A and B are shown apart, each in its own frame.
Chain A
Amino acid sequence: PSRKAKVKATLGEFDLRDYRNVEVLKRFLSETGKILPRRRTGLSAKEQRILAKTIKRARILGLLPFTEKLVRK
C-alpha cells in the first residue's frame, strides 16, 4: 500500500452512525467529491462498508456534492 498521507488517524473515535458530520465526512472528499478509498481510510471491510453507507446517507439527504466541478485541473 502507498503511504504519505493516510486518514485513519485524521480523527479518532468517530461514530459511523451519523450523516450530520459535515467536517469528518468531508475528510474523505478529495476534489470531485469522490470517496477517498481503502487506499486512504485504511478501514476494514466493516469500515468501507458502513462508513460508506453513511457517506451515502450524507449525499442522500444532501449537504455534500457526491462529486463536483473540480477547480484546479
Chain B
Amino acid sequence: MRRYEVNIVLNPNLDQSQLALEKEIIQRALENYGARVEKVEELGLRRLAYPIAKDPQGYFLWYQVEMPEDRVNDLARELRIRDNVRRVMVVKSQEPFLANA
C-alpha cells in the first residue's frame, strides 16, 4: 500500500442524512478496498470558477491516505459511481517544492 491524497467533490444540493449515507459509503467502501485514512480533512462546500455539475458550487472532500496502490483505479470507479461525485480525483502523495525562496 502507498499513499495518495483523495481529492473528490460531491454534490452541493445535499443535506443531512444524505451527507451521512453517501459519505459513509465513501468510508466502508474505501476500507473494503484497502483504504484507511491518514488525513481526514475537507474544506466543506465551496464554489468554482466554472459551472460544472450544472451548478456554481458543491461540496468538496479531501482525505489523504494509505491504500493498496493499484486499487486506486478500482475504488475510484466505485466512487464516481454514486452520481453526485461531481469529481473523483486521486494523486500520488508528494508535496515538496519551494519556488521563489
Q: Enumerate chain A residues within 8 angstroms of B97, measured Cβ to Cβ.
A: 15-17, 50
Q: A15-B95, A33-B49 are in contact. List 18 more A-B contacts (CB 8 A).
A: A9-B100, A11-B100, A12-B100, A13-B99, A13-B100, A14-B99, A15-B96, A15-B97, A15-B98, A16-B99, A17-B95, A20-B43, A47-B99, A62-B87, A63-B46, A63-B49, A66-B50, A68-B50
Q: How far is the CA of A12 from the CA of B48 in the complex (A)?
A: 25
CB distance from A13 to the nearest CB of B (A): 5
Contact B100 A63 (CB under 8 A): no
Interface size range on B against A: 20 to 34
Q: Does B76 reach chain A (CB closer than 8 Å)? A: no
Asked whether B35 is an interface residue with its Cβ less than 8 Å from the other chain, the reply is no
Q: Which residues of A lie under 8 Å from residue B43 when comparing CB positions? A: 20
With the chains together, A64 CA to B49 CA distance in Å? 4
In the assembled complex, B7 has its CB within 8 A of some CB on chain A:
yes
Per the 8 Å Cβ criterion, residues 28-47 of B in contact with A are: 43, 46-47
Nearest CB of A to B2, in Å: 16
Residues of A within 8 A of B (CB): 8-9, 11-20, 33, 43, 47, 50-51, 57, 60-66, 68
Residue of B nearest to A26 (CB): B49
Q: How far is the CB of B6 from chain A (nearest CB, A)?
A: 11
A19 touching B46 in the complex, CB below 8 Å, given contacts A13-B100, A43-B99, A51-B99 = no
Q: What residues of A have a CB within 8 angstroms of the CB of B98 in the complex?
A: 13-15
Complex Cα spacing A13 to B91, Å: 23
